[PDB]
Design brief:
part of a larger assembly; 3 chains; viral protein; SARS-CoV-2; glycoprotein
Amino acid sequence: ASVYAWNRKRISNCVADYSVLYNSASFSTFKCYGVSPTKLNDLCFTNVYA
Amino acid sequence: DSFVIRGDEVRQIAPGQTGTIADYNYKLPDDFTGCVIAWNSNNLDSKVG
Amino acid sequence: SALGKLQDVVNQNAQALNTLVKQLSSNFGAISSVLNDILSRLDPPEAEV
């Protein structure tokens, strides 16, 4: 999608393994603000967005 | 500490930063004191192929 | 209310203790007022802050 019309896909009822994002070299920038990338596997979230 | 790394990966060589090259190969302490100095090596460490 | 002088001491002490306990629920500008959440969410450089 475009920047003015960004796609908003709500994520729920998942068991996510963030290693497919963190260890992948295909992502040129991995920045987190409220949390740390390595510890995402230890937390449970609702209200998840993308 | 002398090493050769990519141009875009120099930002990962900093206190309190993470990355692929910064974990498996060379890890810095968070309270590291000193300097990090780098300069271009394309003219001496690269070939056409 | 004949014994109000002792009751005032008791209530003042209890109120001070209650205020001290309720101060644990203030984040004081941090992301959370619970230490376990900070320890389980962040790396040491930002968890330290």
